[PDB]
């Protein structure tokens, strides 16, 4: 059972002009999932520090970031708070209304695009280097679910039958055909240590067979 959903208008514009505007600093967008991932990671460790029953769903916290050149896919995996299902239809847990009027004023006032984050929609940055995005997530309150677009103006929603998660967030980038240099190991190894030093939770990066 596959429930469709379009995107708010806002919301659909502000995928458009990342999927369509010039912008060659692509790199961005790692460092912006493995904030957000970083972010979930904080606030199940604050449930936790009153309730230590909220990790009885996975006690490691950390993030994995998985290439796969025979699927084309980088999956940034976290083992954080998790969205709800009404999260994951309310923009992925953020405010992307305001937060999207608040970046495009900002962009025709100076800003660029790496500067998305400040506006509490880093998640759409993915769409910088992806066709499509799979998110696979597990909150404590809720069931297992998959969200996913390739923009265009919907997404969907699902019950996910696939692998257990136990508690956190998969988004699956399908890359794009000419961004598959995001699949090797010493560039995601170079924008971590640029952008990402600092990430108080262990980055592991996998690597293929
Ligand atoms: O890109 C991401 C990464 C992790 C996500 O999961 C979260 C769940 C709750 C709060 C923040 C984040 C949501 C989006």
């Known amino acids: ?10 919301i659909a ?3 458009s002009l990342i999927i369509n505007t010039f912008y060659s600093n692509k790199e961005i967008f790692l460092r912006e999932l493995i904030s957000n991932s970083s972010d979930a990671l904080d606030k199940i460790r604050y449930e936790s520090l009153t309730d ?6 996975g006690k490691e916290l950390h993030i994995n970031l998985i290439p796969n050149k025979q699927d084309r896919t980088l999956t940034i995996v976290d083992t ?3 969205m709800t299902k009404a999260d994951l239809i309310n923009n992925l847990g953020t405010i992307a ?7 495009m004023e900002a962009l025709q006032a100076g800003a660029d695009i790496s500067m998305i984050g400040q506006f509490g929609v880093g998640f ?9 995005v799979t998110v696979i997530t597990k909150h404590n309150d809720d069931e297992q679910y998959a969200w996913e677009s390739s923009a265009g103006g919907s997404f ?23 961004q598959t240099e995001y ?9 971590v240590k640029k952008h990402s030093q600092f990430i108080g939770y262990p980055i592991t990066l996998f690597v293929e067979k």
């Open 1 to 10: 059972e596959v429930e469709t959903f379009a995107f708010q208008a806002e």
């Open 13 to 15: 514009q502000l995928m």
């Open 52 to 57: 230590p029953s909220k990790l009885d769903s």
């Open 80 to 82: 954080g708070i998790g």
């Open 97 to 103: 209304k305001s937060g999207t009027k608040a970046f």
């Open 124 to 132: 759409y940055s993915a769409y910088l280097v992806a066709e499509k």
């Open 156 to 178: 969907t929603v699902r019950t996910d039958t696939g692998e257990p998660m136990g508690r956190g967030t998969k988004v699956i980038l399908h890359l794009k055909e000419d």
């Open 183 to 191: 699949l090797e190991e010493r560039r995601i190894k170079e924008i």
